[PDB]
Design a binder for this molecule. Structure first.
Ligand code: HEM
Ligand code: HEM
Ligand SMILES: Fc1cccc(CCCNCCc2ccnc(-n3ccnc3)n2)c1
Ligand SMILES: Fc1cccc(CCCNCCc2ccnc(-n3ccnc3)n2)c1
Ligand SMILES: C[C@H](O)[C@H](O)[C@H]1CNc2nc(N)[nH]c(=O)c2N1
Ligand SMILES: C[C@H](O)[C@H](O)[C@H]1CNc2nc(N)[nH]c(=O)c2N1
Ligand SMILES: [Zn+2]
Lengths: 407, 411
């Protein structure tokens, strides 16, 4: 019931008790581990509210207070009566910070308590959403000095009136198939790009075209908007040793902003809750750039380096991967845009694990996602045992809105 | 119940039915995943079901299920158990057993090779000197002058748990580690404790940075004894680099034969507590873990210095850069001396074809992603991108406690 986690590089052992608060299921059983699988009414609502409020009031040291009892009373009254309820701003902010705190796949959680939360629960239309989003983009971008933020749209009601951002991130590049058969731009987004076009977008059909926003308010058909270009901070990619690196013509955007998740607080569901922090270099340089089904540039780069691409055992892929990643970091640093390397990021997360074990009795973590996609065992998270489990408030996935939307 | 795994690079979805045969537990529950936790005297009672299930599998695999030969065997095992309390495996069953334990080892990336495994039957062995002789023969046969051959040597099974055969070394070949009075370590820090026991037991330690450890062997529950592997049987490779000439001057070498000697082999309910096995190395075992783990030889600093990388900021990726060089060096050195080795690209790609083949012929392949993905360059190998289901099948290789923690000394 009380579980140990050991670090095998340092011999440090932590006892997890937080997991005994876990609520939702993992996908594993005692016969089978699903650790590596990417995706494994009034009556329901009141227990959820209660459990949330109890943790809120305990966090502010008024557990069992009149105000605590008054609040459960009032919420209960409101559910009974209205069959949903409204969070106080303070509960909303607490909820958001804790969903991030509980996100076991996020390596950046040492920052969890410095989150700017923008309350967009008064929003009613897609123009309104667009406005909130641009303000979010500009506030978080902060001219290169990035600041974490989340903007929270109204919560689900009958599920006929959902707010959704159709983009998976606020900022991504488009994807186009050539008659050629190959893919121009980001192959991850070829479908979303199609939906934009079939909805009205005039694509410039380039390699790095910032996609339009596709915003749905109150369950209406979504609408298109171009983020003012001047709010989209982009970084040209050069290498500090290889002059020819810049001729590859690569750039990435500064703002990493996930927009397709569902935020659950005290049983309430916020289907549009775009959030943003800042990049760990490997996301772009290892995944965005070198995934086979992404920009997949390893071959072009190894070429330019004149490596022996004849046998896998020269480690030419490995060599090129490192250079690319050095360049990403160098470029963001030279242009003064916040970025973190995988060494620094994982070392900070180890320190956060320690704080969490000590002050909270644990920290849910997904080893498969936390260990960087390059140089695994030379980062300390590789050697750290982690327990993965689901605590609420949480961010969850939800189906792509195009599959659910009734047109 | 059918379970799907998906490869997110290729979109290949596979369907697992084999996990239905899984008996032992994982460590996980519906409420906690322990997929990254390293570690999450049998009675007649439990034993016949375990024998039965095994012999059913053996007879199926040979297209003789339900045959008279099948029934007579169950029959014979059943009477052997009730009367003697244990039973003896046929050679054919032992062979099938050892191969399937490898086939089922979900932390092994090398399993495309599972059906080519030389099994040495050492069940007639009685003494430590007997064990030493068996182990020398295995090393010579596996090494094969650089052209490595997978092998396993199986010592007598556990009886009452008071007469166990054990190899006290964790691997047949490993370098000594010595803690110095100033706190630094000479040689391999992973082997300081075991080195100390060898010394206590009478080993004259040369005290260098690459001293091959003696064998510490326990037969029949007796106190174990020391033997030095003939050095002519210990194939080693000096490490140099194809471009960098100062690399040789680091004075690195490694041995060629990777041989696990501390696992327990379970077959049909029998426990083989000494069952050393060996294949050949994937480059990263040595170049990433042995050389660059902080708690192992840890050469990253000295390497990067010599490369004169900017070392004052982690964001130079100086560490990542030295790491690739060292790994090229290891693969270069082995290929040049014609000692079998495989890079992590080649190995993982072969594993994916193995794993696919296993779903089509067998209905699954248990696999531990945390261990299968290589410890450098994870996502530029096809395994990173492969979903995997991990579960326990027997026959199997299991961990067991270190014998110095449990051994009852005779004097
Ligand atoms: C401050 C800098 C931050 C860093 C360096 C960071 C780092 C990361 C990384 C590397 C991932 C994995 C992404 C992937 O492989 O797809 C991730 C996922 C995630 N992060 Fe963060 N994060 C940061 C801020 C935030 C904030 C502000 C939130 C929420 C308020 C958040 C919540 C999450 C969630 C929910 C995931 C999982 C997304 C998914 O499953 O696709 N993070 N984080
Ligand atoms: C033929 C070449 C082989 C290769 C390239 C290979 C590769 C590997 C690697 C890289 C590991 C992980 C080692 C670690 O990180 O600690 C491993 C583990 C393992 N391999 Fe192999 N292997 C091979 C042959 C064998 C053979 C012959 C057997 C048994 C007959 C075997 C059974 C296992 C087992 C049981 C493990 C798990 C060890 C542990 O938990 O400590 N492998 N293999
Ligand atoms: F399980 C899955 C199957 C298919 C896709 C998927 C989502 C992968 C994308 N995760 C978010 C990537 C991303 C992008 C920008 N920013 C962040 N970000 C910002 C702060 N923390 C994360 N994260 C999961
Ligand atoms: F769960 C654990 C906690 C602590 C240590 C541990 C074992 C680590 C060593 N793994 C074996 C390494 C090794 C060495 C030589 N050869 C092989 N080898 C040969 C064939 N397959 C693997 N493997 C597990
Ligand atoms: C199959 C496997 O779960 C999948 O490839 C995972 C592996 N680890 C990951 N880790 C992170 N951070 N992000 C990812 O998208 C993935 N993908
Ligand atoms: C804590 C964690 O599970 C531990 O470091 C594991 C990670 N993955 C590994 N993978 C391999 N192949 N070998 C190992 O020793 C480990 N160690
Ligand atoms: Zn699990």
């Amino acid at each position: 019931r009380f579980l140990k986690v050991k670090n095998w590089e340092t011999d440090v052992v932590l006892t997890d008790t937080l997991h005994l608060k876990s609520t939702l299921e993992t996908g594993c059983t005692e016969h089978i581990c699903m650790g590596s699988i990417m995706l494994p009414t009034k009556d329901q609502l009141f227990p959820l509210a209660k459990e949330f409020l109890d943790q809120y009031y305990s966090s502010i040291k008024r557990f069992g207070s009149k105000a605590h009892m008054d609040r459960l009373e009032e919420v209960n009254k409101e559910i009974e009566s209205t069959s949903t309820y409204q969070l106080k701003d303070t509960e909303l902010i607490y909820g958001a910070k804790h969903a991030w705190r509980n996100a076991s796949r996020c390596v950046g959680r040492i920052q969890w308590s410095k989150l700017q939360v923008f309350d967009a629960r008064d929003c009613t239309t897609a123009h309104g959403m667009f406005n909130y989003i641009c303000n979010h983009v500009k506030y978080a971008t902060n001219k290169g000095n990035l600041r974490s933020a989340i903007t929270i749209f109204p919560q689900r009601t009958d599920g006929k009136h959902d707010f959704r951002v159709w983009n998976s991130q606020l900022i991504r590049y488009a994807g186009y198939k050539q008659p050629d058969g190959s893919t121009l731009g980001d192959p991850a987004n070829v479908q979303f790009t199609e939906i934009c076009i079939q909805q009205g977008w005039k694509a410039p059909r380039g390699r790095f075209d910032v996609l339009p926003l596709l915003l749905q308010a109150n369950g209406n058909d979504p609408e298109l908007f171009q983020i003012p270009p001047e709010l989209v901070l982009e970084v040209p990619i050069r290498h500090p040793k290889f002059d020819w690196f810049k001729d590859l013509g690569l750039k990435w955007y500064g703002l990493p902003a996930v927009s397709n998740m569902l935020l659950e607080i005290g049983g309430l569901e916020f289907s549009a809750c775009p959030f943003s922090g800042w990049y760990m270099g490997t996301e772009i340089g290892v995944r965005d750039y070198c995934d086979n089904s992404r920009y997949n540039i390893l071959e072009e780069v190894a070429k330019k380096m004149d490596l022996d691409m004849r046998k896998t055992s020269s480690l030419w892929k490995d060599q090129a991967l490192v250079e690319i990643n050095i360049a990403v970091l160098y470029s963001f640093q030279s242009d003064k845009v916040t970025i973190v390397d995988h060494h620094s990021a994982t070392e900070s997360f180890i320190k956060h694990m320690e704080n969490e074990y000590r002050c909270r009795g644990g920290c849910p973590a997904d080893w498969v996602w936390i260990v960087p996609p390059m140089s695994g065992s030379i980062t300390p998270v590789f050697h750290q045992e982690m327990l993965n489990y689901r605590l609420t408030p949480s961010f969850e996935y939800q189906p792509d809105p195009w599959n659910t939307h009734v047109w």
